[PDB]
């Protein structure tokens, strides 16, 4: 709950998802170590090499 809301830079664009192409898939890095990664899904145009912000760090991986 009480966590510092963290900026995050991406690895490669891993394609569209979300049944309409309205989500992308970016798999950010958490700014401190280069081995801590999680596969995620943001909406909006990417431009690989950006820095996006995570409201919280522990939600879900996209696999059913």
């Amino acid at each position: 709950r009480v966590q510092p809301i963290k900026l995050a830079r991406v690895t490669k664009v891993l394609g569209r998802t979300g049944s309409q192409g309205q989500c992308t898939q970016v798999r950010v890095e958490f700014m401190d170590d280069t081995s801590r990664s999680i596969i995620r899904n943001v909406k909006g145009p990417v431009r690989e090499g950006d820095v996006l912000t995570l409201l919280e760090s522990e939600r879900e991986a996209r696999r059913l």
């Binding site: 709950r1 760090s57 522990e58 939600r59 879900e60």
Partner: protein, 137 residues
């Protein structure tokens, strides 16, 4: 003080943690080393009010938060895990409330010992509740 056994600083006391990772609900019922003394049986299905979202991963995430904020409260430190499922007659693969009720636990500063699938398994018993042609959606 009245909570917490007298333990050294760099060590840890063990209490097992049963995870009932089923369909329609999940339990993150924690207890002592023996299993007997119920310490905190908090449920994902109590903290969501939608009833589609009782089995949901997000409920089982915060289900692990309330028990970890209670685990460190009494004094129990490191949790062996005794993951289950619906078991026996019914399905045995865990529900949505397995990983989110286990990954959220280790992010919540809490040491883990032996995790183990301890769902019940029959030796050919208990005619299943579907009928011959089964339940049909």
């Amino acid at each position: 003080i009245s909570l917490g056994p007298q333990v050294a600083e760099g060590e840890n006391v063990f209490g097992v943690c049963h995870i009932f990772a089923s369909f329609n609900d999940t339990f993150v019922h924690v207890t002592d080393l023996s299993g007997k003394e119920t310490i905190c049986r908090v449920t994902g299905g109590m903290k969501v009010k939608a009833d589609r979202d009782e089995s949901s991963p997000y409920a089982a995430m915060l289900a692990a938060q309330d028990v970890a904020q209670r685990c460190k409260e009494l004094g129990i430190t490191a949790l062996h895990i005794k993951l289950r499922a619906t078991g026996g007659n019914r399905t045995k693969t865990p529900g949505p409330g397995a990983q989110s009720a286990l990954r959220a636990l280790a992010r919540s500063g809490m040491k883990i010992g032996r995790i183990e699938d301890v769902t019940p398994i029959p030796s050919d018993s208990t005619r299943r509740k579907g009928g011959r042609r089964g339940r049909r959606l």
